[PDB]
């Protein structure tokens, strides 16, 4: 069956310009009765569509985007690339690449079927740096009928993702990762939080696991109640 | 170009149930020229129906759509515990091709209240000069729910940044959080601080507070 | 023009079996051009089938029609009680267009027979020189009956009103009345009344009557 | 969704017009593949078609209709109008404002749907009147099995309608009102009876409470049994 | 809804004509899109077709019978007519008359609903004769494990039909009719024979009421066991 | 002209089974031109299918048929009391038209044998100088079966008739009988006549005869 990877960057300044590559296998760009194009979908939002392209060189795209857009394609090794230009922060999605329908009689571009993996971008100046690990030491204010809470906070950390992992992987039960959200500065923070009984506080010292690929940083930091 | 309007904005229903979707278009679609899509969190989206009577290739009997005009629908007969996603209605009857604004599906279950915690800052942050003060809720149901933060008996605006995770899979039921960032000298100045939470399943709204310094 | 026809005029069924409805038509419909429309009592009407095969949008699966030529049916696999209501046919093959009669449908009942009651005209009445005879029916079935009124042993003709309340919605049985009306003069020199009812489940017809003047 | 309201006077004297407007909401009646009709439902009969109009002014009318009915459409506003004279008691009825269907090749006007609310119309000279209640007072030759039967008579009222309660709603069970029925004179007339217990006719005194918004008239009664 | 109904004499001579009437209500002949022709099905065999008419006038026929078949149409009096001449033993049958269907573009015969109520026809110079009943008596030979049979025999008779009953229908149990055989001599016979009890035979003495209408003979028959 | 052939020429089930028939042509049908008919013995025919797939108006829906070329079927989804009647199937592709032969359906039934009983001729016809012997079949099925006369030991042939009664509806079973016609010459001068029957549920031939003038 008919297959499609991408191939980016996956994180760009603004202003520059943005390559993307999506390579077909199982089928034929040349020989066939599909269009290929690009989709994209912001964090939290819906579909967008993009462009598209045809084997003999006609593109279509959208009109909100016929100005930045720009499609090729190498039949030759059996691609089709996208070159958006003057990015923005408000740029920043997961890009999909897809094998578009299309009518015989007219041309144009049908539904969307099948689709490629994805790869999202991050459209930002900010510069790689590492976790700020804190930890939210329980206390009578966090406890409810004998039910303890207490988490390990992570803040000023770019770009994603980040990993926190309780006890090597040996707690899971009760575990709660909160999906990072972007600071005013344009860093990224996020709160892991797993409730345990009360009567267990002082039996087990808890460990929150962090770990940041980007800047290759390993942190493990261990929480306790405060002393006061 | 044409803009489609998908309706319910979420849909709730228990496992086995039957759940309709609407995508109405705001002027005349030709040939019947729709498409539905069907994306589960956190992956590439899935052809399910085109030209709004036509199932795609290995897709489950239970998916079936219909309509014409302005008015499409799609109908499962028997829900299924991974039919809980968005989906996402296409037009392609005239020229540029828009998509809808997507219609999450989540697991109905019974009322269920906040247990409101609060954490005072830590004094590793205290000392790089930034101060953040978070209150939780965990294992509410349903998703909506408003929270504001008070200094010193004063609202705070601009300056709460809120999260909440994904339904869950054991219990099916939210996780909400509000954070509240302050730089040093703020968090000083000030000495009393509470984060309320209003919520269906709360007759009143249930405060949890705590005072600076206080072992 | 083309004259639709309806029958039967009314349809009578127990909840939950199949009611098949014909729309028989005095020519040619071109097209299998017919639709049907559903009204309920005081509501405007609306539209369930067109084409006599298309089913409307948000209609009930329950709903289908069927036909060719000058025979049309509506058949609905099993009843509700929100079901029981007026239904029309329109063709719409050749101008200009044309309705049917109607075909109402009601919730069929074990056979039950009337209560008659009578009352003298009232006092307050009477000082304006007119006087009111009102013979009641309570809770019959079928709905179904013949009424009159005789003065003094004499058939009364072109003088009395008849009016029947809608099917109960708990014991699914009318209520026929008749009424009077005459002068002053009339109502004074006659000294017997008599109200007769005629119905399935009497054996033989039942007569109420009163005397004037008698305490 | 698309939705269409009626608009007009209710009461007009014999031989003068009928002037009756739609208003659609939720669609334009320009752009748009649908035509603009009237329907009418006079009293215990079936529904008749009156006339049509499409955007560009061009009308149809029922043969029978053809000479008195006048449509009027006004793009402008979103509105379309009617406009029946020599009005006779023979047009009284509830009018509709649908959204008629056509075909494309010929323009011909097909099926009816949405409907309207609907706005019933009388035509009859009788001027505006009150009500004149009456007692029906209970008796032995109403009580049957031990359960009586008793009554509360309206007569020469217009127009419609009579609002008729018992106890101020306190009673509900066995009350029945009868439809009203036109009389010769031009006015109509309803009597609403309850059936109660006998034994309970010497224990409550019923009160039967008319209300009528025409005339801005109410006016209670009581029904006890007659003292003969 | 339409009807048809047929009319003709029942009993013709071998080698004269056989005229039959087709009388159509609720349908006019002239206003509709459908012919009307004749089938006919000879006792214990198939249907067979024999032609059409149209409003126009113009008939097609069997191309085995198409020298002896004449159709008409009279769309005044709404009826069409068969004409069949030559008659023979062999065309004995039972004759209907339906509403033929057709293709617009080629105006050939297609299905033949509805059909009518069939009239049958016998073709034989026999004259009319009464029925010669003989009984069948009981006896050891039919009588088998306690239970006895008995008949009453019918022959030469002509035409049909003859109705067999046993003491005025009081006895239906049991009771069978043979269906007539026609004979070399051109006389119908047939035989009833009912299972009785042979406990039975010795209290009741049965009773074959055997009746004929075409020669207004009414004859009963007792049958009792053989006195040898 | 196109022949029709249908098959089985009898079909046999029990009430509620599942019935298909056959209807074979000689040579191409075109556009599907088949009809099918059902005649109760006695009455009429009616239309059931035309087209070979479309079913006429008021047919109920366990009558579907199909099939295209020159093999087409009829099938009944559940057979019910009134079912077991003649079918017949047409052909308008090519004129002229023609029927087919007709496929009877029974009921069937558990095996049952015929009870012979024999009749001597009656004195009064035998003085009109007609004789004429009969041996009646009670109560058998299947419905096939053969008699043979003979006359001193001498078969019959030319001579014999044979009359069989319609199924019967409460046991389902048929009744066959030959009569023997001879004139008075013939059966005076013959002394010794004898009615065999061979059918399935009798192992071997039963036979039963009388002797002429056996008080």
């Known amino acids: 069956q008919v297959q499609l990877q991408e191939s980016g960057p996956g994180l760009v300044k603004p202003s520059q310009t943005l390559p993307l590559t999506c390579t077909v296998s199982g089928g034929y760009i040349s020989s066939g009765s599909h269009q290929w194009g690009w989709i994209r979908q912001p964090a939290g939002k819906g579909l967008e569509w993009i462009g598209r392209i045809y084997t003999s060189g006609s593109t279509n795209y959208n009109p909100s985007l016929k100005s930045r857009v720009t499609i090729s394609v190498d039949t030759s090794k059996n691609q089709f690339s996208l070159k958006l230009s003057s990015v923005t922060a408000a740029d920043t999605a997961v890009?999909?690449?897809?094998?578009?329908?299309?009518?015989?009689?007219?041309?144009?571009?049908?539904?969307?079927?099948?689709?490629?993996?994805g790869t999202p971008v991050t459209v930002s100046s900010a510069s790689t740096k590492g976790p700020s690990v804190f930890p939210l030491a329980p206390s009578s204010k966090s406890t409810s009928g004998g039910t303890a809470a207490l988490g390990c906070l992570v803040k000023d950390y770019f770009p994603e993702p980040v990993t926190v992992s309780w006890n090597s992987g040996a707690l899971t039960s009760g575990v709660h990762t909160f999906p990072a959200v972007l600071q005013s500065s344009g860093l990224y923070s996020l709160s892991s939080v797993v409730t345990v009984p009360s009567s267990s506080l002082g039996t087990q010292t808890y460990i929150c696991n962090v770990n940041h690929k980007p800047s290759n940083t390993k942190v493990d930091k261990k929480v306790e109640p405060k002393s006061c | 170009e044409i803009v489609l309007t998908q309706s319910p904005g979420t849909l709730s229903l228990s496992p086995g149930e039957r759940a309709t979707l609407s995508c109405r278009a705001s002027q005349s679609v030709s040939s019947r020229s729709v498409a539905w899509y069907q994306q589960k969190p956190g992956q590439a989206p899935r052809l399910?129906?085109?030209?709004?009577?036509?199932?795609?290739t290995g897709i489950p009997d239970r998916f079936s759509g219909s309509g014409s005009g302005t008015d499409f629908t799609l109908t499962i007969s028997r829900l299924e515990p991974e039919d809980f996603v968005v989906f996402y209605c296409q037009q392609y009857g005239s020229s540029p091709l828009t998509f809808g604004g997507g219609t999450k599906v989540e697991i109905k279950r019974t009322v269920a209240a906040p247990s409101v915690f609060i954490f005072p800052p830590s004094d590793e942050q205290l000392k790089s000069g930034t101060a953040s003060v978070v209150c939780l809720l965990n294992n509410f149901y349903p998703r909506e729910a408003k929270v504001q933060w008070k200094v010193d008996n004063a609202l705070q605006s601009g300056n709460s940044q809120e999260s909440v995770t994904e339904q869950d899979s054991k219990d099916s039921t939210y996780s909400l959080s509000s954070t509240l960032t302050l730089s040093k000298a703020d968090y000083e100045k000030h000495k009393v601080y509470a984060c309320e939470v209003t919520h269906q399943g709360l007759s009143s709204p249930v405060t949890k507070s705590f005072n600076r310094g206080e072992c | 023009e083309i004259v639709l026809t309806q029958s039967p005029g009314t349809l009578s069924l127990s909840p939950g079996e199949r009611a098949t409805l014909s729309c028989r038509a005095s020519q040619s419909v071109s097209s299998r051009s017919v639709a049907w429309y559903q009204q309920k009592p005081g509501q405007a009407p609306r539209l369930l089938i067109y084409?006599?095969?298309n089913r409307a949008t948000g209609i009930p699966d329950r709903f289908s029609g069927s036909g060719s030529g000058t025979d049309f049916t509506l058949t609905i696999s099993r009843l509700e009680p929100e079901d029981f209501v007026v239904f029309y046919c329109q063709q719409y093959g050749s101008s200009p267009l044309t309705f049917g009669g109607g075909t109402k449908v009601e919730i069929k009942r074990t056979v039950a027979a009337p209560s008659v009651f009578i009352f003298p005209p009232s006092d307050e009445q009477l000082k304006s020189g007119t006087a009111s005879v009102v013979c009641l029916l309570n809770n019959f079935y079928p709905r179904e009956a013949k009424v009159q009124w005789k003065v003094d042993n004499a058939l009364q003709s072109g003088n009395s009103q008849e009016s029947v309340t809608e099917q109960d919605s708990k014991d699914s049985t009318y209520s026929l009345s008749s009424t009077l009306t005459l002068s002053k003069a009339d109502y004074e020199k006659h000294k017997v009344y008599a109200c007769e009812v005629t119905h399935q489940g009497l054996s033989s017809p039942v007569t109420k009557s009163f005397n004037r003047g008698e305490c | 969704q698309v939705q269409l309201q009626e608009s007009g006077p209710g009461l007009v004297k014999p031989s003068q017009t009928l002037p009756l407007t739609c208003t659609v909401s939720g669609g334009y009646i320009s752009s748009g593949s649908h035509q603009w009709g009237w329907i009418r439902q006079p009293a215990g009969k079936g529904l008749e078609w009156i006339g049509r109009i499409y955007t560009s002014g061009s009308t149809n009318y029922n043969p029978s209709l053809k000479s008195r009915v006048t449509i009027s459409v006004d793009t402008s506003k979103n509105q379309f109008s009617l406009k029946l004279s020599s009005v006779t008691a023979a047009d009284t009825a509830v009018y509709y404002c649908?959204?008629?269907?056509?075909?494309?090749?010929?323009?011909?006007?097909?099926?009816?749907?949405?409907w309207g609310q609907g706005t019933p119309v009388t035509v009859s000279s009788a001027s505006t009147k009150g009500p004149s209640v009456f007692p029906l007072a209970p008796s032995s030759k109403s009580t049957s099995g031990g359960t009586a039967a008793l009554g509360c008579l309206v007569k020469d009222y217009f127009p419609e309608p009579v609002t008729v309660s018992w106890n101020s709603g306190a009673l509900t069970s066995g009350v029945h009102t009868f439809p009203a029925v036109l009389q010769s004179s031009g006015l109509y007339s309803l009597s609403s009876v309850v059936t109660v217990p006998s034994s309970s006719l010497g224990t409550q005194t019923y009160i039967c409470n008319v209300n009528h918004k025409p005339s801005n008239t109410k006016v209670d009664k009581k029904v006890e049994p007659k003292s003969c | 809804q339409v009807q048809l109904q047929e009319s003709g004499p029942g009993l013709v001579k071998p080698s004269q004509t056989l005229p039959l009437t087709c009388t159509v209500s609720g349908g006019y002949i002239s206003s509709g899109s459908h012919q009307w022709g004749w089938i006919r099905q000879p006792a214990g065999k198939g249907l067979e077709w024999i032609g059409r008419i149209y409003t126009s006038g113009s008939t097609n026929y069997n191309p085995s019978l198409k020298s002896r078949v004449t159709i008409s149409v009279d769309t005044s009096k709404n009826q069409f007519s068969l004409k069949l001449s030559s008659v023979t033993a062999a065309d004995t049958a039972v004759?209907?008359?339906?509403?033929?269907?057709?293709?617009?573009?080629?105006?050939?015969?297609?299905?033949?609903?509805?059909?009518?109520?069939g009239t049958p026809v016998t073709v034989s110079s026999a004259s009319t004769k009464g029925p010669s009943v003989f009984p069948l008596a009981p006896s050891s030979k039919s009588t088998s494990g306690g239970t006895a049979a008995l008949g009453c025999l019918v022959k030469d008779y002509f035409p049909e039909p003859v109705t067999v009953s046993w003491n005025s229908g009081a006895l239906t149990s049991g009771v069978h009719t043979f269906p007539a055989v026609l004979q070399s001599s051109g006389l119908y016979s047939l035989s009833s024979v009912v299972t009785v009890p042979s406990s039975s035979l010795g209290t009741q003495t049965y009773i074959c009421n055997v009746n004929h209408k075409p020669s207004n003979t009414k004859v009963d028959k007792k049958v009792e066991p053989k006195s040898c | 002209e196109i022949v029709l052939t249908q098959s089985p020429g009898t079909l046999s089930l029990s009430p509620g089974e599942r019935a298909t028939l056959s209807c074979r042509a000689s040579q191409s049908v075109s556009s599907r031109s088949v009809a099918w008919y059902q005649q109760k013995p006695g009455q009429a025919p009616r239309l059931?299918?035309?087209?070979?797939?479309?079913?006429?108006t008021g047919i109920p829906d366990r009558f579907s048929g199909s099939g295209s070329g020159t093999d087409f079927t009829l099938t009944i989804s559940r057979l019910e009391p009134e079912d077991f009647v003649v079918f017949y199937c047409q052909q308008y592709g090519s004129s002229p038209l023609t029927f087919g032969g007709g496929t009877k359906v029974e009921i069937k039934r558990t095996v049952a044998a015929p009870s012979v009983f024999i009749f001597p001729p009656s004195d009064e016809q035998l003085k009109s100088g007609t004789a004429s012997v009969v041996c009646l079949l009670n109560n058998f099925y299947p419905r096939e079966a053969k008699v043979q006369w003979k006359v001193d030991n001498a078969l019959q042939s030319g001579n014999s008739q044979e009359s069989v009664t319609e199924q019967d509806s409460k046991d389902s079973t048929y009744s066959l009988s030959s009569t023997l016609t001879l004139s008075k010459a013939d059966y005076e001068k013959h002394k010794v006549y004898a009615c065999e029957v061979t059918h399935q549920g009798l192992s071997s031939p039963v036979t039963k005869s009388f002797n002429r003038g056996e008080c």
């Open positions: 649908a959204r008629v269907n056509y075909d494309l090749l010929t323009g011909r006007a097909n099926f009816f749907d949405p």
């Open positions: 084409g006599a095969s």
